[model samples]
Target: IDVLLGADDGSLAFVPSEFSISPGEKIVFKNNAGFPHNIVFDEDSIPSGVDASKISMSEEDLLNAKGETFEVALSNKGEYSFYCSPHQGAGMVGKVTVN
Candidate 1:
């Protein structure tokens, strides 16, 4: 399993323009910055990315600056993208390279 934490982007968001993980690996989206953050997976779409309003991670409701975390399992050998529920459209996004 691998962990992805929030970046100090002034607001609660992921720093990297892109992120990747291995196949069968787990993604742990953590809130390590100020403000509350949420995560969502895209419904098989490119450019549009993950629909922050549709898909969700394991941990959805508990908001935290240092405690909140989202978990997801990658079983398919494909690239999956995700985004921050609030900042997704704004550019906070990541990728998972499951190979």
Candidate 2:
């Protein structure tokens, strides 16, 4: 699935802040806002068996590659929380529930 990193509508948050998927599904974070954005999962917010590092992108990496896309493959079943570091305080957060 394609997720707008920064939505085309200039919303300072993820278009669909909440979503659900089956195990093994993949999600792609794309740049649609024409500005810097990123996806960083909350380390403690995912399933116990998941690796947080594998689901997040660093601020520096994301900023340096604006307009690029990031992908995450969900293999565990649980709720995942994430945010854009640059616009996080503006409430740019999102969640994914895997089943």
Candidate 3:
């Protein structure tokens, strides 16, 4: 599955912020709209034993250009929540549930 990060209009959001996917599926977060966005998973907020680092990006590693992307896979059954470090307060968050 693919999640779009931000919008061309400069909105701080993740298009289709909530969704589900099967285990082992790869989800790609693309900076196809706004620039300088990055995905930072709330490790403590996720299901126990699942490492958020598996899908999260470093805060300083921003996707500065349109089309830049981050990829991750889910093997655990749980709901994962994440946000863009620079825009979390503006609702730039997303949730991906793996079943």
- Which stretches of model 2 miss by more than 4 angstroms? 63-67
Per-candidate Cα lDDT values, in order, are 0.59, 0.82, 0.86
Q: Candidate 3: worst 10 consecutive residues by lDDT?
A: 7-16
* Residue range 20-86, candidate 1, lDDT tens digits: 6565567666667654666666766423343434335533554456767777656656666766666
Ranking by lDDT: 3, 2, 1
Question: Model 3, 13: alpha-carbon shift in Å?
Answer: 1.0
Kindly report which residue stretches of model 1 are placed more than 4 angstroms away from their true locations once superposed.
Answer: 1-5, 9-12, 15-17, 46-55, 58-62
lDDT of 3: 0.86
Pairs with steric clashes in candidate 1: 42-50
What is candidate 1's TM-score against the reference? Answer: 0.67
Query: How far is 1's C-alpha from truth in model 2 (Å)?
Result: 1.7
Let me know the TM-score candidate 2 reaches against the reference structure. Answer: 0.89
Please give, for residues 6-94, the per-residue lDDT of candidate 3 as tens digits: 87687878987999999899989999666689999898878899877777898888999888889998888888888999889888998
Look at candidate 3 and tell me the lDDT of residue 82: 88
